[PDB]
Write a protein that binds this DNA or RNA. Structure first.
Lengths: 183, 229, 178, 70, 74, 150, 50, 7, 76, 432
RNA sequence: GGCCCUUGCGGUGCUCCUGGAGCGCUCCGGGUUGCAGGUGCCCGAGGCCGAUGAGAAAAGCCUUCUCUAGCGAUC
């Protein structure tokens, strides 16, 4: 607690209460939680453990002979699922399958996709909008921030109708119609 | 330091009854078999197993001096054991209800929490266990008891239950004269931070925990004869 | 805050924080920083000097020499004794404040009040008696100091309406009193 | 405490013959009276012992004797 | 012990800290054990008890020349 | 902090327990003496020092010596003077020496030290006091006369 | 009934002024200070290292 | 009350 | 300098039947302030722990209420 | 009533042919008793059981719900019940007093009193008295009796007015006697002296209670609905609570060692008063209240059927739940200028009060969006709207624009199924 | 429409019954409580980004701690 003296530091070396990197890896985890707002630590664990399963499958598939029908069919099946969710940039080789992390799952959540589509500029603002029922994926309205959006479904995230934020957007563009909006 | 020194598999099923001996620094574990196991971080097996009840044990408590051990079980028996090498039940008493929790003060008073009622047994304590013949004080709580502890240097008892938290007045439970350099209630922030460094300089390694706190004093007899050879 | 409301309602003058520390000391005559450097002997001497000065103007004070301005009162601390002792002390302090009320504008009365505040903490235990003693002089500034000694922040307190004269350091207006 | 405190400072109109008799009633085995026992010896108290026992329980419940009563 | 089982295995990690040899001039290990029993810290002893236990064997004034012994101070 | 004060109280303990042996003082009186001695000791071992604390310490020990002297005549016990009275006088001499070292320029403290040495101390101790006085206060003719007068 | 509870006088245990130093009562009861052998061994071990 | 239960 | 507390009955009364209210009125104002009953039933049953120094208390509820407080003074 | 195994107090109120039990902590219903063939006339409680009397037969209730013991053998109505240990004392109309053992149901003792000479109007068993009961009469005499010996210990000449109430004071030998003239007499029965006297000019003394929280205060009720608070220490009137109940006070009791007063009346109200304000000003703390006037119109509301809307002559609209009384709610009084009512309260604003509702129609659709209740008042041209979710009167008064006078009144109202429209008929013959 | 010590105006402080989630109380009854086998759990940062990214900016309260400077060591 107090600044240790020169003689005290030698005997009390490696003693630090707040930072335990080997045990819980909290400092590394904290950067992930803050960068992509995660309500619960448990959600990060499920992403991390699932990421290991994807990587473990790829390393095992590599060990199989290159000229094997089982490997080729499994490799094509694995990459098309990952590409559909948006975890892998292109449907290339299995080398791209090794780059997936728990952060890859976080980048596919609805609040951060809202950020990329420029509907919101701030991540806490993006989480606020879904929790207050202003964003819909198709006719259905999504309230849960933990919601991985598919690339195909990404085209159809938009403001729910009869919402104040949509009124502000239309008012700025000089396209505000009382008949269509409020109805 | 922030590292896990030991992780031991008790191999006894669910663990829900646990206590330590402040004199001995060992950990006591209660089980449904009726046995209490003594544990230390160094060993992968319990130091000792003591059969105390004909049914499952649900409470355990020891005194500050480390001499007496108090246990209760599903057979509705309250037991006091002499931990100083004998491990025999000094006193036995049958109870109408079941004592869920047990605690010991610094002067030797024993409190048992049965349902919504707490009972305190008092004895002279001068080289003697508490007397289970007749309780000292009684009190009825609003709800069933879920936790008991004595304040270190005050004559009050802390009770946790469903209704909330209550503080009782227990005359004669707290030790009167405290040491200013070890545990000072009236200590400033600068006094506290000086003490913490002294404690950190003086931390005891985990492997030194044994059934005898003075085990370091005796000469290693087996290492003697190896050297003599 | 429900726990906070229960805890703040459970608060009592006996378990005050200032009893267990000398960071802050309440004083009618001095600022708290200088008041925290005053020994009990000095405050006892000031109180005895004030009472000795008061004895010249009015004799009938002599009866307060023994219970309040002696060695027994010097050693006595209220928290240690029972409720009956505190009740007898309350009677003695109320009688002494009733006697003090005519002479409150004089300096010896202020010294005696300072000794009483230092030793018996009458600003915590005897708020009503102190207010009754000081009330007829509400137009003065020493009244403002005595009010500043008290803690009346809670809106449900009996003396909450006296809050602004503590916060702004101005005498109480007669219209508000009426 | 008492030293410190010092330093700081007819005939009843009617009588009942059942009450004058020194008969004993069972304090134990009666639900209302067993809660009023103090030690194990008072399984059966006399008439005079019961009266002061009943009176002191009433005064403890009332919180004492009111000033206007005397 | 009627219903108590005591683990007979030795704590090898704790045994490493114990003294292996029996120091001179001690013939029996009971003799050596007696000397180490008394604690010496100020935590367990009074201040004047602490001072007599930590008495230095040789005390020298920092600046004075030390001369050899001279006939019991002559 | 309290280690020096603790040393001094444990030094004061043997004469108190001998006084309890005498029957001169009761156990509660010994407890009160210990409490007030500790309270006075705490004042003079601080980092900030004042002269009145030393004066109060000296006055308390003088009052205790006078009380012991009055009670010994009534009891009639004249044994064990050295165990108690000489120890108290030595402690008071140490307090006076520290006070005089801290405040050399105060003549009144020096004269009080001389008076106490006259009343309770050996003549050689009083002889040493005058030499300390005249060494640093040789510019006052009155102090020379007082030493010659004695 | 006769009842007494421990009641420390705060003026005894708290210093009088800011200029005063904190009062430290000491108790040498062995029950308050356990582990006298292992605790002293670590201090001796630290002394040799220093 | 101390009335006998019967008669 | 201190002495342990005591409680003994008179005229053969049993200490078991003595209630807390009888104690509070017969003990000084300082110790009487240490007896209090916090009422938090909306949350689950509570587990409590005292610090090694008797000044601080911390408690935890089954439903998830965690609070630490000095218990001598009434501060949170 | 105090309870064993539960350190709480319970208050029991008679409701027609049954009785209800509530905890005094929060006025929450804990039990409802079984019905009896006749209306309950007298009630008593002894901790373990609740005793109720109907006609010439009285029974004992266990668990606050069901009867376990019934007692027959009286030829007249019972007005008084006194629990006495394991025995019960019942007093008839003609003047028969019989002591019964509760469990065995046999008759211990039978005593008769001449109706012309001594008609019992009040009974009291003083505390700490062995087998002794105190009897009061309408003629004004008092008799002290011993049940065990079956002899008359002493006769008090008393006063010529007549006794209406008997209450045990917080003293060993002191009782409080109420008289028909409005006079309360504090008397010591052992040595026969009167400590003090109090007089109220509101009629006979209904009930007396004593405050035992450390303040010497006595409360006496009146048939006018007023309560007088008297200081026993200084023998003076502290303060008076006027119109505590609109009807006559039935029973008032101070909770033991508490600054709380429990009162009920014939206005279908049970109320709690707390004396914690400055100068001892009682204020309303809690209440459980229903309609205080006879009902005018009741109609089921909702297709689910767990609530009924009711209107009464007191000018209020209320909803009563059919599953549990915790869901009961009140829509308030009929009031124009609601903002003025906020400033002054319900009282001092009696002018803006509306006449009682005679007929109303309610529809459940669109209840979230706007008003769904239309009501017509007595002798009033306009019709008022009500809101169920907001639990208050609506914002419109529906009238023909051309009419302004009240000579024509509204007679028939109805609301459409969709809830958009309301149809109102008039006495002149116009439908709008 | 009605209002007459008023207001298309505003604000406060208490009371208003936990589904599971304050159980156990008419009577009766509670006395002699009469060592199977367990090896768990945790450990990935790469942007088809927005504007560094617990966005940025400002005020009032507690918590933890850092520097000097006197002062204390004379018995």
């Amino acid at each position: 607690v107090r600044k240790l003296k020169f003689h005290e530091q030698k005997l009390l070396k490696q003693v630090d209460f707040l930072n335990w990197e080997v045990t819980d890896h909290n400092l590394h985890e904290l950067r992930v939680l803050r960068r992509y707002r995660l309500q619960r630590r448990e959600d990060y664990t499920r992403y991390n453990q699932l990421s290991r399963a994807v990587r473990e499958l790829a390393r095992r598939l590599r060990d199989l002979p290159e000229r094997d029908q089982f490997r080729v069919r499994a490799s094509a099946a694995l990459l098309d699922k990952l590409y559909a969710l948006g975890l892998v940039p292109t449907r290339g080789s299995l080398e791209l399958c090794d780059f997936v992390t728990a952060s890859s799952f976080c980048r596919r959540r609805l609040p951060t996709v809202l950020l990329k589509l420029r509907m919101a500029q701030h991540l806490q603002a993006a989480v606020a909008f879904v929790e207050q029922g202003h964003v819909r994926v198709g006719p259905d309205v999504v309230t849960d921030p933990a919601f991985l959006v598919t690339r195909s479904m990404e085209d159809f995230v938009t403001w729910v109708d009869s919402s104040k934020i949509k009124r502000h957007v239309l008012e700025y563009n000089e396209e505000r119609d009382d008949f269509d909006l409020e109805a | 330091v922030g590292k896990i020194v030991a992780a031991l598999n008790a191999r006894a099923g669910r663990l829900d009854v646990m206590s330590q001996n402040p004199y001995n620094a060992v950990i006591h574990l209660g089980h449904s078999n009726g046995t209490v196991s003594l544990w230390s971080p160094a060993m992968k097996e319990p130091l000792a197993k003591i059969l105390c009840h004909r049914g499952g044990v649900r409470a355990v408590a020891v005194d500050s001096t480390g001499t007496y051990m108090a246990t209760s079980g599903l057979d509705h028996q309250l037991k006091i054991f002499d931990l100083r090498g004998t491990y025999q039940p000094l006193s036995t008493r049958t109870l109408p209800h079941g004592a869920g929790h047990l605690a010991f003060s610094q002067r030797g008073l024993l409190v048992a929490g049965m349902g919504d009622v707490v009972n305190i047994w008092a004895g002279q304590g001068k080289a003697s266990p508490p007397s289970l013949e007749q309780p000292y004080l009684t009190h009825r709580l609003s709800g069933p008891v879920h936790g008991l502890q004595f304040c270190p240097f005050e004559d009050v008892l802390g009770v946790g239950h469903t209704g909330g938290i209550t503080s009782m007045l227990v005359p004669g439970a707290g030790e009167p004269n405290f040491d200013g350099l070890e545990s000072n209630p009236y200590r400033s922030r600068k006094q506290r931070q000086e003490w913490e460094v002294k404690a950190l300089l003086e931390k005891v390694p985990a492997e030194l925990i044994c059934l005898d706190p003075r085990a370091l004093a005796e000469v290693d007899v087996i290492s003697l004869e190896q050297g003599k050879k | 805050t429900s726990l906070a409301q229960q805890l703040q309602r459970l608060a009592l003058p006996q378990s005050d924080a200032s009893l267990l520390s000398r960071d802050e000391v309440a004083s009618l005559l001095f600022d708290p920083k200088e008041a925290a450097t005053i020994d009990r002997d000095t405050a006892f001497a000031i109180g005895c000097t004030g009472l000795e000065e008061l004895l010249g103007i009015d004799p009938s004070f002599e009866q307060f020499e023994a219970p309040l301005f002696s060695q027994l009162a010097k050693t006595l601390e209220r928290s240690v004794q029972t409720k009956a002792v505190n009740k007898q002390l309350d009677e003695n302090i109320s009688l002494f404040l009733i006697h003090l009320s005519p002479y409150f504008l004089l300096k010896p009365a202020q010294k005696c009040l300072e000794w009483l505040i230092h030793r018996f903490h009458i600003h915590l235990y005897n708020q009503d008696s102190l207010i009754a003693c000081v009330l007829p002089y509400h137009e003065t500034r020493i009244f403002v100091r005595v009010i500043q000694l008290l803690k009346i922040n809670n809106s449900k307190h009996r003396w909450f309406w006296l809050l602004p004269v503590k916060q702004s350091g101005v005498p109480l207006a007669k219209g508000t009193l009426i | 405490e008492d030293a410190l405190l010092r330093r700081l400072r007819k005939k009843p109109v009617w009588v009942d013959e059942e009450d004058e008799d020194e008969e004993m009633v069972d304090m134990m085995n009666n639900r209302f009276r067993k809660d009023m026992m103090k030690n194990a010896s008072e399984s059966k108290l006399s008439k005079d012992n019961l009266k002061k026992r009943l009176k002191e329980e009433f005064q403890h419940a009332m919180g004492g004797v009111p000033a206007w009563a005397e | 012990l009627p219903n108590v089982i005591i683990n007979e295995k030795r704590n090898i990690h704790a045994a490493a800290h114990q003294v292996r040899v029996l120091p001179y001039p001690f013939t029996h290990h009971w003799q050596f054990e007696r000397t180490i029993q008394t604690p010496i810290g100020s935590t367990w002893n009074t201040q004047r008890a602490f001072q007599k236990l930590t008495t230095p064997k040789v005390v020298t004034k920092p600046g004075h020349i030390i001369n050899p012994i001279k006939a019991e101070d002559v | 902090m309290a280690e020096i004060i603790q040393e001094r109280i444990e030094d004061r303990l043997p004469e108190l327990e001998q006084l309890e042996r005498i029957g001169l003082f009761s156990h509660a009186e010994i407890k009160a003496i210990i409490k007030k001695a500790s309270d006075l000791e705490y004042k003079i071992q601080r980092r900030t020092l004042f002269k009145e604390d030393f004066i109060n310490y000296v006055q308390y020990e003088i009052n205790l010596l006078e009380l012991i002297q009055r009670r010994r005549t009534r009891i009639g016990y004249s044994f064990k003077k050295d165990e108690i009275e000489n120890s108290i006088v030595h402690r008071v001499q140490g307090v006076f020496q520290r006070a005089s070292a801290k405040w050399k320029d105060d003549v009144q403290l020096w004269l009080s030290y001389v008076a106490f040495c006259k009343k309770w101390a050996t003549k050689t101790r009083l002889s040493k006091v005058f030499s300390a006085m005249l060494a640093i206060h040789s510019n006052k003719p009155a102090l020379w006369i007082m030493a010659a007068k004695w | 009934m006769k009842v007494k509870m421990l009641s420390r006088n705060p003026d005894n245990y708290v210093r009088e002024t800011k200029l005063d130093l904190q009062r430290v009562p000491r108790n040498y009861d062995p029950a308050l200070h356990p582990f006298e052998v292992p605790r002293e061994y670590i201090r001796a071990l630290n002394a040799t290292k220093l | 009350s101390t009335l006998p239960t019967c008669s | 300098a201190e002495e342990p507390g005591f409680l003994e009955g008179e005229d053969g009364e049993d200490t078991a039947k003595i209630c807390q209210a009888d104690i509070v009125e017969a003990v000084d104002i300082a110790s009487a302030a240490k007896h209090f009953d916090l009422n938090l039933r909306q949350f689950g049953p509570y587990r409590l722990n005292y610090s090694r120094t008797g000044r601080h208390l911390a408690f935890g509820g089954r439903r998830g209420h965690v609070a630490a407080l000095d218990w001598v003074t009434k501060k949170l | 009533r105090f309870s064993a195994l539960k350190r709480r107090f319970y208050v029991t109120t008679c409701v027609g042919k049954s009785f209800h039990t509530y905890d005094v902590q929060k006025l929450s219903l804990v039990a409802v008793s079984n019905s009896v063939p006749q209306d309950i006339c007298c009630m008593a409680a002894d901790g373990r059981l609740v005793f109720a009397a109907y006609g010439n037969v009285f029974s004992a209730f266990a668990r606050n719900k069901e009867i376990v013991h019934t007692f027959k053998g009286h030829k007249a109505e019972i007005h008084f019940l006194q629990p006495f240990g394991d025995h019960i004392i019942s007093v008839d109309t003609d003047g028969i007093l019989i002591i019964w053992h509760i469990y065995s149901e046999e008759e211990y003792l039978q005593l008769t009193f001449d109706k012309s000479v001594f008609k019992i109007s009040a009974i009291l068993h003083p505390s700490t008295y062995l087998n002794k009961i105190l009897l009061g009469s309408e003629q004004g005499s008092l008799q002290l009796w011993n049940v065990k010996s079956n002899k008359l210990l002493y006769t008090f000449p008393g006063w010529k007015v007549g006794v209406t109430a008997l209450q045990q004071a917080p003293a060993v030998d002191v009782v409080a006697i109420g008289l028909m003239s409005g006079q309360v007499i504090i008397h010591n029965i052992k040595f026969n002296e009167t400590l003090m006297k109090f007089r109220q000019d509101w009629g006979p003394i209904t009930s007396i209670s004593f405050r035992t929280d450390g303040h010497p205060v006595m409360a006496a009720g009146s048939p006018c609905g007023h309560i007088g608070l008297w200081d026993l220490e200084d023998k003076k009137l502290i303060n008076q609570m006027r119109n505590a109940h609109s009807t006559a006070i039935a029973g008032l009791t101070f909770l033991h060692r508490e600054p709380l007063l429990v009162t009920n009346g014939a206005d279908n109200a049970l109320r709690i008063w707390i004396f914690d304000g400055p100068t001892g000003e009682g204020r309303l703390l809690r209440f459980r209240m229903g309609h205080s006037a006879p009902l005018t119109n009741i109609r089921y509301y909702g297709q689910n059927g767990q609530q009924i809307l009711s209107a009464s002559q007191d000018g209020t609209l209320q909803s009563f739940s059919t599953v549990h009384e915790k869901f009961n709610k009140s829509l308030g009084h009929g009031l124009i200028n609601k903002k003025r009512v906020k400033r002054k309260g319900l009282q001092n604003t009696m002018s803006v009060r509306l006449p009682p509702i005679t007929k109303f129609a309610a529809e459940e659709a669109r209840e979230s969006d706007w008003d769904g209740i239309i009501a017509c008042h007595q002798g009033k041209l306009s019709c008022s709207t009500w809101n169920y979710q907001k639990s208050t009167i609506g914002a419109y008064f529906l009238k023909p624009k051309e009419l302004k006078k009240d000579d024509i009144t509204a007679t028939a109202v109805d609301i459409t199924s969709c809830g958009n429209f309301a149809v109102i008929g008039l006495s002149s013959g116009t439908v709008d």
